[PDB]
């Protein structure tokens, strides 16, 4: 049942992959490992193959490898990066040292389709719809992305979009204010804040909150969404955090209609619901998909949710060989998608 593997050196690393993956071509590398483009002769698909670096070097590396693999195996949605294949040239656990991950080759992210231009309202609808459809699924697995930005959104020529965690082979511009401040209780709508920032930028052709630094970022945010009202302040536990809010100059929320000039009034309404300062009042991914702005794309019967995602491993402190063994189990149990 094991396919025939072949060796090949690139960039200065011995790749050992099953024969089905042909014409390996390095696309990039980093501290995580290396990625090659390949042709999958089994499927006729152009795939990316990633060889992890130092997957089991330490307890932390091993747990990270297991984390990454477990998550990828669980993410099964059109708008979220998933797994076509996972393999190892190892024939046993004792042999097991390398992990390779396989996914659809992606050639572009949101930045390089947009090219910092105004997109049409129809195009924005389609892109934002997809992000939110992916987010609904992600959030239903009780996961928060936390790092949504244009570089974490892969987009093909047909503007079909997938959410990434790591980009292709600043961030503060899309971060929710509660993360910018050190408010130690955030919800999934931190990702909705990010989506609103992305949406605004797609519509306007300009970064919504291009802060120069941490402080500037919050200044820019608060100028638009206002300083915390009395309802929000009542939910802030630390005196000094409230002291920090009050010390800074008090400004009203701007009317987004007087900000996003010429935009579809439904786009403006949705942005208002995404960019509420109080995260308790921020629209969810599922509620946003039902918003009238998405009427041409919304299908309540094809916006699926994820299976329950068991994240209990996160609280465990195990030895390297235990994490390695658990990862090995996940490699061998992988069933390709249909
Ligand atoms: C930075 C860490 C990365 N990991 C992957 C990856 C590869 C295989 C499997 C999985 C789960 C992730 C990446 C990936 C996935 C799919 N496509 C790409 N493609 C590219 O990076 C790319 C860039 C320019 C031109 C052509 C291709 C990268 S990037």
């Amino acid at each position: 049942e094991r396919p025939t593997f072949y060796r090949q050196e690139l960039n200065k690393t011995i790749w050992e992959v099953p024969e089905r993956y042909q014409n390996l071509s390095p696309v990039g590398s980093g501290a995580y490992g290396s990625v090659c483009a390949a042709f999958d002769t089994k499927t006729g698909l152009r795939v990316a193959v990633k060889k992890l670096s130092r997957p089991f070097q330490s307890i932390i590396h091993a747990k990270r490898t297991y984390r990454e693999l477990r998550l990828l195996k669980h993410m099964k949605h059109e708008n979220v990066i998933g797994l076509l294949d996972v393999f190892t040239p190892a024939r046993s656990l004792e042999e097991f040292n390398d992990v390779y991950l396989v996914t659809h080759l992606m050639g572009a992210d949101l930045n390089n389709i947009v090219k910092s231009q105004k997109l049409t309202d129809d195009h924005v609808q389609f892109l934002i719809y997809q992000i939110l459809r992916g987010l609904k699924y992600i959030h239903s697995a009780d996961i928060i992305h936390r790092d949504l930005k244009p570089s974490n959104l892969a987009v093909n020529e047909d503007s079909e979009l997938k959410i990434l965690d790591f980009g292709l082979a600043a961030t503060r511009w899309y971060r929710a204010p509660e993360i910018m401040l050190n408010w130690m209780h955030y919800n999934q709508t931190v990702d909705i804040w990010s989506v609103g920032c992305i949406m605004a930028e797609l519509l306007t052709g300009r970064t919504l909150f291009p802060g120069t630094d941490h402080i500037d970022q919050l200044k820019l945010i608060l100028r638009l969404v206002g300083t915390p009202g009395a309802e929000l302040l009542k939910k802030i536990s630390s005196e000094s955090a409230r002291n920090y809010i009050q010390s800074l100059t008090q400004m009203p929320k701007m009317n987004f209609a007087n900000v996003f000039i010429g935009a579809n009034p439904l786009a403006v309404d949705l942005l208002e619901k995404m960019l509420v300062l109080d995260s308790d009042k921020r629209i969810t991914a599922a509620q946003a998909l039902a918003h009238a702005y998405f009427a041409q794309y919304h299908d309540p019967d094809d916006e699926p949710v994820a299976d329950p995602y068991d994240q209990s491993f996160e609280s465990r402190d195990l030895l390297i060989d235990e994490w390695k063994s658990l990862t090995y189990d996940e490699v061998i149990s992988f069933v390709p998608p249909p």
Side-chain angles (χ1 to χ4, degrees), residues 3 15 37 58 94 115 119 169 172 179 189 196 267 270 296 298 327:
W15 286 61
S58 63
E94 19 299 344
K115 299 170 201 288
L119 300 182
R172 77 182 167 260
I179 299 167
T189 73
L270 186 66
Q296 78 177 319
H298 176 47
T327 304

Short mmCIF file of all heavy atoms in Angstrom, two decimals, residues 3 15 37 58 94 115 119 169 172 179 189 196 267 270 296 298 327:
data_model
loop_
_atom_site.label_atom_id
_atom_site.label_comp_id
_atom_site.label_asym_id
_atom_site.label_seq_id
_atom_site.Cartn_x
_atom_site.Cartn_y
_atom_site.Cartn_z
N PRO A 3 3.37 3.88 -1.42
CA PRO A 3 3.89 4.27 -2.74
C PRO A 3 5.42 4.28 -2.78
O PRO A 3 6.07 4.29 -1.73
CB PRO A 3 3.34 5.68 -2.95
CG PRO A 3 3.03 6.19 -1.58
CD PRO A 3 2.62 4.98 -0.79
N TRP A 15 14.58 16.10 -0.23
CA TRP A 15 13.15 15.81 -0.30
C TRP A 15 12.91 14.38 -0.74
O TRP A 15 13.45 13.94 -1.76
CB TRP A 15 12.46 16.76 -1.26
CG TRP A 15 12.29 18.14 -0.74
CD1 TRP A 15 13.29 19.00 -0.38
CD2 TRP A 15 11.06 18.84 -0.54
NE1 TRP A 15 12.75 20.20 0.04
CE2 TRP A 15 11.39 20.13 -0.05
CE3 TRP A 15 9.71 18.51 -0.72
CZ2 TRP A 15 10.41 21.09 0.27
CZ3 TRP A 15 8.73 19.47 -0.40
CH2 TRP A 15 9.09 20.74 0.09
N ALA A 37 6.19 23.76 -5.18
CA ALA A 37 5.11 23.44 -6.11
C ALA A 37 5.40 22.07 -6.72
O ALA A 37 6.55 21.73 -7.02
CB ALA A 37 5.02 24.48 -7.21
N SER A 58 12.23 19.54 19.71
CA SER A 58 12.00 19.81 21.14
C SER A 58 10.56 19.43 21.46
O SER A 58 9.80 19.11 20.55
CB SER A 58 12.22 21.28 21.43
OG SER A 58 11.27 22.04 20.71
N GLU A 94 9.85 4.42 14.67
CA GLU A 94 11.27 4.58 14.99
C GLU A 94 12.03 5.28 13.85
O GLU A 94 12.93 6.08 14.11
CB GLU A 94 11.94 3.26 15.44
CG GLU A 94 11.22 1.95 15.06
CD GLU A 94 9.80 1.80 15.64
OE1 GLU A 94 9.43 2.55 16.58
OE2 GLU A 94 9.04 0.95 15.14
N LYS A 115 -4.22 44.75 -5.62
CA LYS A 115 -3.15 45.69 -6.04
C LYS A 115 -3.43 47.11 -5.52
O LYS A 115 -3.20 48.10 -6.22
CB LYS A 115 -2.93 45.67 -7.56
CG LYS A 115 -2.49 44.33 -8.13
CD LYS A 115 -2.53 44.34 -9.65
CE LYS A 115 -2.61 42.94 -10.24
NZ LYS A 115 -1.34 42.17 -10.12
N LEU A 119 -11.98 47.85 -5.47
CA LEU A 119 -12.73 46.77 -6.12
C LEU A 119 -14.17 47.21 -6.31
O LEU A 119 -14.64 48.12 -5.61
CB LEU A 119 -12.67 45.46 -5.33
CG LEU A 119 -11.29 44.84 -5.07
CD1 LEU A 119 -11.49 43.54 -4.31
CD2 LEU A 119 -10.44 44.64 -6.32
N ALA A 169 4.30 31.09 0.69
CA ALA A 169 5.76 30.90 0.78
C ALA A 169 6.57 31.94 -0.01
O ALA A 169 6.01 32.72 -0.79
CB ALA A 169 6.13 29.50 0.33
N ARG A 172 -0.81 44.78 12.45
CA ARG A 172 -1.54 45.60 13.43
C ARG A 172 -2.71 46.36 12.80
O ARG A 172 -3.70 46.63 13.47
CB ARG A 172 -0.60 46.55 14.19
CG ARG A 172 -0.18 47.76 13.38
CD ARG A 172 0.79 48.68 14.09
NE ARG A 172 1.33 49.60 13.10
CZ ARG A 172 2.52 49.48 12.51
NH1 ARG A 172 3.35 48.50 12.82
NH2 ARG A 172 2.89 50.37 11.59
N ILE A 179 -7.52 43.64 21.41
CA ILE A 179 -6.18 43.01 21.37
C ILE A 179 -5.07 44.08 21.41
O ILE A 179 -4.05 43.87 22.07
CB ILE A 179 -6.00 42.08 20.13
CG1 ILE A 179 -7.01 40.93 20.18
CG2 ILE A 179 -4.57 41.52 20.07
CD1 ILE A 179 -7.13 40.16 18.88
N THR A 189 -15.35 37.52 17.52
CA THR A 189 -15.57 38.72 16.69
C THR A 189 -14.33 39.61 16.55
O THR A 189 -14.37 40.58 15.81
CB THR A 189 -16.78 39.58 17.16
OG1 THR A 189 -16.43 40.28 18.36
CG2 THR A 189 -18.06 38.74 17.41
N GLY A 196 -13.95 43.52 8.71
CA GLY A 196 -14.47 44.86 8.45
C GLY A 196 -13.38 45.75 7.87
O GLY A 196 -13.64 46.50 6.92
N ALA A 267 -23.35 47.88 2.26
CA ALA A 267 -21.93 47.78 2.65
C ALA A 267 -21.68 48.63 3.92
O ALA A 267 -21.08 48.15 4.88
CB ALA A 267 -21.03 48.23 1.52
N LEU A 270 -23.32 47.05 7.08
CA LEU A 270 -22.53 45.91 7.54
C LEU A 270 -21.20 46.33 8.22
O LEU A 270 -20.84 45.75 9.24
CB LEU A 270 -22.27 44.95 6.38
CG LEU A 270 -21.56 43.65 6.78
CD1 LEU A 270 -22.39 42.74 7.70
CD2 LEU A 270 -21.17 42.94 5.50
N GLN A 296 -27.03 38.13 -2.95
CA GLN A 296 -26.75 37.42 -4.19
C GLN A 296 -25.90 36.16 -4.00
O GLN A 296 -25.83 35.33 -4.90
CB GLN A 296 -26.28 38.35 -5.33
CG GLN A 296 -24.84 38.82 -5.29
CD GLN A 296 -24.44 39.67 -6.50
OE1 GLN A 296 -24.81 39.37 -7.64
NE2 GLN A 296 -23.65 40.71 -6.26
N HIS A 298 -25.72 34.48 -0.50
CA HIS A 298 -26.12 33.78 0.73
C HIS A 298 -26.96 32.56 0.42
O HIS A 298 -27.96 32.65 -0.30
CB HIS A 298 -26.88 34.73 1.64
CG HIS A 298 -27.41 34.09 2.89
ND1 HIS A 298 -26.64 33.28 3.70
CD2 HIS A 298 -28.62 34.19 3.49
CE1 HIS A 298 -27.36 32.89 4.74
NE2 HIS A 298 -28.57 33.43 4.63
N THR A 327 1.62 12.42 16.59
CA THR A 327 1.70 12.94 15.24
C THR A 327 1.75 11.82 14.22
O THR A 327 1.04 11.87 13.23
CB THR A 327 2.91 13.87 15.05
OG1 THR A 327 2.83 14.92 16.01
CG2 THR A 327 2.93 14.48 13.65
#
